[PDB]
Design an enzyme around this catalytic site. Sequence first.
Site, mmCIF file in Angstrom:
data_model
loop_
_atom_site.group_PDB
_atom_site.id
_atom_site.type_symbol
_atom_site.label_atom_id
_atom_site.label_comp_id
_atom_site.label_asym_id
_atom_site.label_seq_id
_atom_site.Cartn_x
_atom_site.Cartn_y
_atom_site.Cartn_z
ATOM 1 N N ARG A 13 0.849 -1.092 0.112
ATOM 2 C CA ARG A 13 0.100 0.012 0.051
ATOM 3 C C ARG A 13 0.836 1.266 0.220
ATOM 4 O O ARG A 13 1.736 1.399 -0.710
ATOM 5 C CB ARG A 13 -1.044 -0.113 0.985
ATOM 6 C CG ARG A 13 -1.948 -0.977 0.880
ATOM 7 C CD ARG A 13 -2.890 -1.811 1.866
ATOM 8 N NE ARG A 13 -3.367 -0.559 2.628
ATOM 9 C CZ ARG A 13 -4.826 -0.125 2.404
ATOM 10 N NH1 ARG A 13 -5.691 -0.849 1.606
ATOM 11 N NH2 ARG A 13 -5.190 0.883 3.160
ATOM 12 N N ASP A 142 -3.077 12.386 9.265
ATOM 13 C CA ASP A 142 -4.606 12.255 8.961
ATOM 14 C C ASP A 142 -5.312 13.424 8.678
ATOM 15 O O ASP A 142 -5.369 14.184 9.413
ATOM 16 C CB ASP A 142 -5.407 11.307 9.730
ATOM 17 C CG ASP A 142 -6.469 10.802 9.251
ATOM 18 O OD1 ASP A 142 -7.313 11.475 8.621
ATOM 19 O OD2 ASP A 142 -6.890 9.403 9.594
ATOM 20 N N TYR A 155 -7.471 5.912 17.761
ATOM 21 C CA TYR A 155 -6.745 6.150 16.691
ATOM 22 C C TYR A 155 -6.580 7.775 16.688
ATOM 23 O O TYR A 155 -5.461 8.147 16.214
ATOM 24 C CB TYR A 155 -7.431 5.567 15.516
ATOM 25 C CG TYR A 155 -6.980 6.003 14.166
ATOM 26 C CD1 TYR A 155 -6.037 5.541 13.738
ATOM 27 C CD2 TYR A 155 -7.530 7.029 13.737
ATOM 28 C CE1 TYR A 155 -5.227 5.981 12.375
ATOM 29 C CE2 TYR A 155 -7.174 7.699 12.204
ATOM 30 C CZ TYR A 155 -6.107 7.019 11.723
ATOM 31 O OH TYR A 155 -5.597 7.342 10.457
HETATM 32 N N1 LIG Z 1 -5.312 4.898 3.513
HETATM 33 C C1 LIG Z 1 -5.908 6.016 3.824
HETATM 34 O O1 LIG Z 1 -6.890 6.218 3.337
HETATM 35 C C2 LIG Z 1 -5.282 6.894 4.747
HETATM 36 C C3 LIG Z 1 -6.073 7.775 5.335
HETATM 37 C C4 LIG Z 1 -5.298 8.549 6.324
HETATM 38 C C5 LIG Z 1 -4.365 8.178 6.749
HETATM 39 N N2 LIG Z 1 -3.521 7.328 6.316
HETATM 40 C C6 LIG Z 1 -2.121 7.068 6.851
HETATM 41 O O2 LIG Z 1 -1.172 6.734 5.888
HETATM 42 C C7 LIG Z 1 -0.257 5.706 6.379
HETATM 43 C C8 LIG Z 1 -0.382 4.522 5.336
HETATM 44 O O3 LIG Z 1 -1.772 4.142 5.180
HETATM 45 P P1 LIG Z 1 -2.045 2.606 4.734
HETATM 46 O O4 LIG Z 1 -3.600 2.407 4.384
HETATM 47 O O5 LIG Z 1 -1.053 2.315 3.471
HETATM 48 O O6 LIG Z 1 -1.708 1.798 5.937
HETATM 49 P P2 LIG Z 1 -2.334 0.308 6.111
HETATM 50 O O7 LIG Z 1 -2.179 -0.509 5.138
HETATM 51 O O8 LIG Z 1 -3.488 0.215 7.256
HETATM 52 O O9 LIG Z 1 -0.890 -0.025 7.192
HETATM 53 C C9 LIG Z 1 0.278 0.163 7.219
HETATM 54 C C10 LIG Z 1 1.038 -0.865 7.705
HETATM 55 O O10 LIG Z 1 1.089 -0.664 9.096
HETATM 56 C C11 LIG Z 1 1.845 -1.695 9.726
HETATM 57 N N3 LIG Z 1 1.359 -2.245 10.841
HETATM 58 C C12 LIG Z 1 -0.099 -2.179 11.559
HETATM 59 N N4 LIG Z 1 0.295 -2.590 12.988
HETATM 60 C C13 LIG Z 1 1.405 -2.694 13.030
HETATM 61 C C14 LIG Z 1 2.254 -3.112 14.365
HETATM 62 N N5 LIG Z 1 1.511 -3.496 15.530
HETATM 63 N N6 LIG Z 1 3.469 -2.943 14.199
HETATM 64 C C15 LIG Z 1 4.295 -2.471 13.042
HETATM 65 N N7 LIG Z 1 3.545 -2.513 11.837
HETATM 66 C C16 LIG Z 1 2.372 -2.303 11.819
HETATM 67 C C17 LIG Z 1 1.404 -3.050 8.566
HETATM 68 O O11 LIG Z 1 2.286 -3.548 8.392
HETATM 69 P P3 LIG Z 1 2.291 -5.343 7.952
HETATM 70 O O12 LIG Z 1 1.356 -5.435 7.034
HETATM 71 O O13 LIG Z 1 3.931 -5.523 7.715
HETATM 72 O O14 LIG Z 1 1.943 -6.057 9.354
HETATM 73 C C18 LIG Z 1 0.672 -2.284 7.563
HETATM 74 O O15 LIG Z 1 0.954 -2.893 6.475
HETATM 75 C C19 LIG Z 1 -0.765 5.365 7.899
HETATM 76 O O16 LIG Z 1 -0.113 5.924 8.676
HETATM 77 C C20 LIG Z 1 -2.144 5.703 8.054
HETATM 78 O O17 LIG Z 1 -2.667 5.936 8.866
HETATM 79 C C21 LIG Z 1 -4.083 6.573 5.263
HETATM 80 C C1 LIG Z 2 -7.529 1.505 7.819
HETATM 81 C C2 LIG Z 2 -6.720 2.576 6.920
HETATM 82 C C3 LIG Z 2 -6.667 2.174 5.361
HETATM 83 N N1 LIG Z 2 -5.340 2.365 7.579
HETATM 84 C C4 LIG Z 2 -4.884 3.044 8.618
HETATM 85 N N2 LIG Z 2 -3.577 2.674 9.037
HETATM 86 N N3 LIG Z 2 -5.255 4.551 8.910
HETATM 87 C C5 LIG Z 2 -6.446 4.546 8.084
HETATM 88 N N4 LIG Z 2 -6.839 6.300 8.511
HETATM 89 N N5 LIG Z 2 -6.869 4.059 7.199
HETATM 90 C C6 LIG Z 2 -8.397 4.261 6.577
HETATM 91 C C7 LIG Z 2 -9.547 4.017 7.432
HETATM 92 C C8 LIG Z 2 -10.748 4.347 7.017
HETATM 93 C C9 LIG Z 2 -10.792 4.852 5.732
HETATM 94 CL CL1 LIG Z 2 -12.263 5.633 4.934
HETATM 95 C C10 LIG Z 2 -9.577 5.161 4.887
HETATM 96 C C11 LIG Z 2 -8.439 4.905 5.354
#
Ligand SMILES: NC(=O)c1ccc[n+]([C@@H]2O[C@H](COP(=O)([O-])OP(=O)(O)OC[C@H]3O[C@@H](n4cnc5c(N)ncnc54)[C@H](OP(=O)(O)O)[C@@H]3O)[C@@H](O)[C@H]2O)c1
Ligand SMILES: CC1(C)N=C(N)N=C(N)N1c1ccc(Cl)cc1
Lengths: 249, 247, 249, 248
Positions: A13, A142, A155
């Site tokens: 991701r 975020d 969170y």
């Molecule tokens: N995606 C979005 O829409 C969105 C929105 C707002 C903010 N963000 C922020 O952007 C960053 C990337 O988002 P994403 O959706 O790519 O994140 P994600 O897929 O939900 O998680 C990123 C990685 O975090 C690692 N993780 C989870 N728990 C952990 C633990 N206990 N110890 C160590 N690593 C751990 C996991 O690694 P493993 O898979 O190796 O277990 C996971 O693949 C995050 O900080 C997220 O909060 C994303």
């Molecule tokens: C779950 C996910 C993908 N993962 C992390 N680590 N942080 C968020 N903010 N995420 C996220 C949660 C809800 C939505 Cl609607 C979009 C992204």
Amino acid sequence: EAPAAVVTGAAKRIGRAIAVKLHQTGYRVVIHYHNSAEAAVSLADELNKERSNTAVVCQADLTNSNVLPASCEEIINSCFRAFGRCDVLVNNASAFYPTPLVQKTVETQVAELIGTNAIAPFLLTMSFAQRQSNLSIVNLCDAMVDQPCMAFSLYNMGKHALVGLTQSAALELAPYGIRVNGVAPGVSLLPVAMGEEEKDKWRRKVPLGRREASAEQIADAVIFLVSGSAQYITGSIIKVDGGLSLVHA
Amino acid sequence: APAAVVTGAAKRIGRAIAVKLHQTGYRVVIHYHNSAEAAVSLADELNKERSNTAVVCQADLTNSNVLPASCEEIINSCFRAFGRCDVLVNNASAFYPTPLVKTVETQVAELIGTNAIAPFLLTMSFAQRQSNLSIVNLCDAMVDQPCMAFSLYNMGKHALVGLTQSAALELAPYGIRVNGVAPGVSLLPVAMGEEEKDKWRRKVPLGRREASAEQIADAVIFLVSGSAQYITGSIIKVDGGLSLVHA
Amino acid sequence: EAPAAVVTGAAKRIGRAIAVKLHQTGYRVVIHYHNSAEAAVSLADELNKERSNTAVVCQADLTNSNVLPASCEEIINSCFRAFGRCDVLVNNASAFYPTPLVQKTVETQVAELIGTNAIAPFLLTMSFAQRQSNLSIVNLCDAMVDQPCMAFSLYNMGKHALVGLTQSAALELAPYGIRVNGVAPGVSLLPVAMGEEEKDKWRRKVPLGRREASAEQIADAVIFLVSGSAQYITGSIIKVDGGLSLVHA
Amino acid sequence: EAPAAVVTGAAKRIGRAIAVKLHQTGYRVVIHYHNSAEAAVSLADELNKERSNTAVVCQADLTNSNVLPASCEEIINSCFRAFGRCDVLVNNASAFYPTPLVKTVETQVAELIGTNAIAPFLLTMSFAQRQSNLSIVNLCDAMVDQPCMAFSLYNMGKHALVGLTQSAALELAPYGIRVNGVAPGVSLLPVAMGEEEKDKWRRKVPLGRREASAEQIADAVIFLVSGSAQYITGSIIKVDGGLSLVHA
Ligand SMILES: NC(=O)c1ccc[n+]([C@@H]2O[C@H](COP(=O)([O-])OP(=O)(O)OC[C@H]3O[C@@H](n4cnc5c(N)ncnc54)[C@H](OP(=O)(O)O)[C@@H]3O)[C@@H](O)[C@H]2O)c1
Ligand SMILES: CC1(C)N=C(N)N=C(N)N1c1ccc(Cl)cc1
Ligand SMILES: NC(=O)c1ccc[n+]([C@@H]2O[C@H](COP(=O)([O-])OP(=O)(O)OC[C@H]3O[C@@H](n4cnc5c(N)ncnc54)[C@H](OP(=O)(O)O)[C@@H]3O)[C@@H](O)[C@H]2O)c1
Ligand SMILES: NC(=O)c1ccc[n+]([C@@H]2O[C@H](COP(=O)([O-])OP(=O)(O)OC[C@H]3O[C@@H](n4cnc5c(N)ncnc54)[C@H](OP(=O)(O)O)[C@@H]3O)[C@@H](O)[C@H]2O)c1
Ligand SMILES: NC(=O)c1ccc[n+]([C@@H]2O[C@H](COP(=O)([O-])OP(=O)(O)OC[C@H]3O[C@@H](n4cnc5c(N)ncnc54)[C@H](OP(=O)(O)O)[C@@H]3O)[C@@H](O)[C@H]2O)c1
Ligand SMILES: CC1(C)N=C(N)N=C(N)N1c1ccc(Cl)cc1
Ligand SMILES: CC1(C)N=C(N)N=C(N)N1c1ccc(Cl)cc1
């Protein structure tokens, strides 16, 4: 000669897209992972096929515990061991799940959500700074921290604490030449577990294009903040949200 | 090639922005009010690099009955010269104290007219005349810790943050992104003495590096680029950490 | 003697609720109005029947023009002419209507929406300070300034500028013992012209009670900020929005 | 008939002023304390002399640990056992000391993030689970975006408390519980601090060049729990004399 970066949660991701784009820019990378061993090793193999000896993996649980400081010290140490330097830290790993106020133990929820989102970034920052150019740290924030999802208290607390860390570390590490900034996605890659109807609900809220950000679009903001084009920027958080946070209820 | 309008482009930050856009491949309109000689010198330099890629446009951006026509003419000059207008950089700005304790209504016309109303009118004109389209507004990283006795200037910069957000929302459906760059201390007022400039420099956490117009322009170049295609409604501070620093 | 207050746009709605509540607290009031002369004189009559010689009216257009400074000077002068002092200024009057970016002259819309919402509060603040115990100014702000209604750019710009005035004036007037604060409603009294269907759409967005604020609930926050319980508070803006600004799209 | 409130870190300084003003307003109070037992008991005796059976004390460490959720449940339960109801929670207790980036660090985390953020979270959970005018007030910090140098953990804890205030206001609003904050700038200065250093702080404050009294902070808390604030939730009132508006 080549700089080196640590990216947490870099197997899949957004973290993967960040690691790939740093590697494309010229960096050697540490691909941190917790559970995603296969994907981590696969990515490092691909980057190493591109330029040999430019990628390693490092496994760690970033849940808060009395051993998390050692785990964080080890991540940074893995960079120095592999590459002899560590120029960039990207705090990307993050746990995300609801913690309703009204009815895993709650102490485990606190350790995981506050640990991955705030305490592990702080300790990784400490270890990075202690072990020290264009040095910089980028925290994945975020864009919706002030309009939070219902029942995601812990969170949301962790992401707010990460804004505080970005500001405090930017102030404290500036005299060492270390810049500290954030990138704040709105909706980017939606959770794997989410149904299509629910995904489309979120997409339709976004003013610019009615779609989620690609991982690469988030990575592009990280690339900017680590670049020579950002050398007077510290303590800034760049929203990458297509306008979502501007939208009223 | 795409085309950009930069207001207040003859000198200082706006000249640096115009230069960097040109270097990235844009054709540019160099807007000026009093700085005709400087504007033409810059256009001469740019045209020597690539001919017929830079023109000048005179306009006073003080608010008045004729400001809407003036703003329309700035946008129109881009379309006439270049056949399109991809980017609007609202950089022109008046800055001076207005203590609460020139007539006051002239100060209003200048401070609120240049920092907010002209950007509004130029945005309307830019949108109405419509790829990677975007507008970048030059904001101020110290809008919430303002200089003493700068009420009107601070009001204008706050209004420009509201424009940024309101325009990003309303123009998102047209594919026009709208963002800001917020400097802290950049090129100091030429007027300002040296002891007061040093006093400011000393407060910047990243102050080991000098602040430059180029650093501001670099943030503008990112926000207009394809690397910012999902960014709208964002303001990037470029202040060396100054806004973090308590009293 | 009793202290005295100026309330702009005080004939009806929120401004009237603020005037009534200051009057019930013991203030003498100037009821400013623009178009609502009948409603203004009627309110002043009711207040004077409760306590003789405690309410006057003052008419003024607060649209920006080369005469607005004199109009603002005259409102403050009206308070000193009637009551001998002027302790509190409440900047409540406000124009509100759409100004779409893509399609009254636009220069009229600017004069009205930036004049009433930002320039007249600035000039009134200048006149109030220059004509000078618990002195303060309260600006009626808008809790949704960062999540604006679509096509209300100029209204939004004027409310942002009012935040800037609140902060700048608090800083500059603190040495003179004048506090400057704001009250930011979310949805309170809905527009008279709005149909009930549309009113209900807004009500349903409000976390706390799924209803708009009463005028008296807004006035309660103003009354706190002018009181001796807020004597160290300056440059603060209190949201009175039932949680509306926390709700994501 | 009389409502009841829990105030954390209520034995001295700001928390003591909050407890006194709530009592003066007609509340029964639980005075939580950690190490200041003599002062806590002195306050409870004073309050009970004014009106019998209106004040109790409750001791608890609010450092994060495996027993912190039970401790926080016990504090809320103490209010129900003493008074039959719990109308107000004021999260005032706070640790504060520098944690430079360049006690073990995990103890510093447990203390600074526990007292400033996790305990308020757990107390808020306990408060809501156990339920005329219910509200929580969290003591925030007006300088969170212009933080003191080398205070990263304290600043992270106070930012997390802003997030709790917003997230709890949204989630609890259906139950009619309002959640707000009060953010001092400079109020009562640390006991150790020399006058010359205290004056350096005082001179920065625009409004009066002095720190807030504890009673000034308490007054904002009393407004937020009152009938005059019945529509206010998710809001944080800065009580800082203009300090946060002052540039470097
Ligand atoms: N995606 C979005 O829409 C969105 C929105 C707002 C903010 N963000 C922020 O952007 C960053 C990337 O988002 P994403 O959706 O790519 O994140 P994600 O897929 O939900 O998680 C990123 C990685 O975090 C690692 N993780 C989870 N728990 C952990 C633990 N206990 N110890 C160590 N690593 C751990 C996991 O690694 P493993 O898979 O190796 O277990 C996971 O693949 C995050 O900080 C997220 O909060 C994303
Ligand atoms: C779950 C996910 C993908 N993962 C992390 N680590 N942080 C968020 N903010 N995420 C996220 C949660 C809800 C939505 Cl609607 C979009 C992204
Ligand atoms: N440290 C900094 O420099 C700093 C800090 C914070 C924010 N900013 C923002 O960044 C932007 C650029 O800063 P800067 O120092 O380069 O600006 P500047 O030199 O002070 O002024 C830029 C241009 O504004 C134009 N201008 C002034 N009044 C005008 C009017 N009535 N009509 C039309 N144009 C007018 C002038 O053009 P002519 O010369 O042609 O008359 C001037 O050259 C501004 O928006 C400013 O507020 C800068
Ligand atoms: N109502 C809400 O839900 C809400 C939400 C957010 C913010 N607010 C803010 O709270 C304040 C009060 O709201 P409200 O709904 O009571 O306001 P309103 O009824 O829309 O307007 C208040 C008064 O403004 C005066 N006014 C309008 N144009 C003017 C002009 N050109 N010159 C002088 N006066 C003028 C009018 O006085 P006359 O009638 O005498 O002409 C009007 O009665 C306003 O600042 C508003 O922006 C309200
Ligand atoms: N004073 C100011 O200028 C100022 C400025 C900004 C924000 N604030 C905020 O306003 C609140 C009141 O400030 P204050 O100066 O009165 O606070 P303070 O005296 O520093 O601390 C309040 C109480 O916190 C309790 N506490 C500390 N560690 C604890 C732990 N591990 N477990 C349980 N309780 C613990 C202590 O109780 P015991 O004494 O019983 O051990 C202490 O008396 C705090 O939240 C503070 O962060 C104050
Ligand atoms: C029109 C009204 C009542 N009046 C002014 N002056 N300002 C607002 N923000 N208003 C308002 C606009 C929309 C909504 Cl839904 C509620 C109040
Ligand atoms: C130590 C004190 C009094 N106590 C807590 N719990 N929080 C603060 N912010 N404090 C504080 C620290 C420094 C200054 Cl100058 C003022 C108050």
